[PDB]
């Protein structure tokens, strides 16, 4: 287990998201679905010239998995997946400018829902989650677990859990007052309202 500090700007953005009173929290789901869609686009495109890249799984889709017992909402995709360098360095590097621009926009009146326009929508997860754990697997690389409860640091480790074929699994450990996002009807509403134009199947797993 290695522990890292977030880039300064990103840590500041996370603090703002966590501490600003903002009722329209449902936007987190659209942003995570959008990220999955981008990752799916990437593996789809790469497979067009190298179909062996789908040996780790041909289906390109997104599953939404609420679990009231664990108080978790899981967003799983079979996209390209992330490398160790993605988790430690690249995600942060490619987000820096958008983060700075988003922070400036906020100070100048813009509202939190604009976050996705700046390419940093992931961090809206912290509107509803006290901790986010992400398992990811890129071809020809190992499975990793990323995790953060904010507060300025994240961890990365090699994951010895159940093998994913390829893709990314975002596990939102929800805040006690945010359990509405574990309800079937609510998730359906949110997906229809914000994520109706995604080129991959989105499947809601109903709890038994």
Residue with tokens 């109903």: 206
Please answer whether residues 195 and 33 qualify as being in contact, where contact means their C-beta atoms are separated by less than 8 angstroms.
yes
As measured in angstroms, the least distance from the Cβ of 60 to ligand FJS is 11
Longest dimension (CA), the chain: 48
- Dihedral, CA of residue 17, residue 197, residue 68 and residue 169, to nearest 10: -80
As measured in angstroms, the least distance from the Cβ of 207 to ligand FJS is 22
Rule CB under 6 A: choose which of 8, 38, 142, 207 binds ligand FJS: 38
23 or 152: CB nearest ligand FJS: 152
Please answer whether residues 113 and 127 qualify as being in contact, where contact means their C-beta atoms are separated by less than 8 angstroms.
no
Please, which residues have CB within 8 angstroms of residue 107's CB and are 6 or more apart in sequence?
none
The interface region with ligand FJS, picked from 2-10, 73-81, 182-190, 198-206 by CB under 6 A, is 73-81
The answer to the question of whether 175 is labelled as a binding residue is no
152 vs 130: CA distance, rounded Å: 13
112 vs 114: CA distance, rounded Å: 5
As measured in angstroms, the least distance from the Cβ of 146 to ligand FJS is 5
130 or 185: CB nearest ligand FJS: 130
User: In Å, what is the CA distance from 30 to each residue of 52, 54, 84, 98, 171?
Assistant: 30, 26, 25, 18, 15
Binding mask 95-134 for ligand FJS (x = CB under 6 A): ------------------------x--x-----------x
32 or 65: CB nearest ligand FJS: 32
81 binds ligand FJS (CB under 6 A): yes
**Residues annotated in a binding site for ATP:** 35, 77, 96, 122
Which residues of the chain form contacts with ligand FJS (CB under 6 A)?
32, 35-36, 38-39, 42, 77, 79-82, 91, 119, 122, 134, 146, 168, 170
């Amino acid at each position: 287990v290695e522990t890292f500090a977030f880039q300064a700007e990103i840590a500041q953005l996370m603090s703002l998201i966590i501490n600003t009173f903002y009722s329209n929290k449902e936007i987190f789901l659209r942003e995570l679905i959008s990220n999955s869609s981008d990752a799916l686009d990437k593996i789809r495109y790469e497979s067009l010239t190298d179909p062996s890249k789908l040996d780790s799984g041909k289906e390109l889709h997104i599953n939404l998995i609420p679990n009231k017992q664990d108080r978790t909402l899981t967003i799983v995709d079979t996209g390209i997946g992330m490398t160790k360098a993605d988790l430690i360095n690249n995600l942060g590097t490619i987000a820096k400018s958008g983060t700075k621009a988003f922070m400036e926009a906020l100070q100048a009146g813009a509202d939190i829902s604009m976050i996705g326009q700046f390419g940093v929508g992931f961090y809206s997860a912290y509107l509803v989650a006290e901790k986010v754990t992400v398992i990811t697997k890129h071809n020809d690389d190992e499975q990793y677990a990323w995790e953060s409860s904010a507060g300025g640091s994240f961890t990365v480790r090699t994951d010895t859990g159940e093998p994913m074929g390829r893709g990314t699994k975002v596990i939102l450990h929800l805040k006690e007052d945010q359990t509405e996002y574990l309800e079937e009807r609510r998730i359906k509403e949110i997906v229809k309202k914000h994520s109706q134009f995604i080129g991959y199947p989105i499947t809601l797993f109903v709890e038994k």
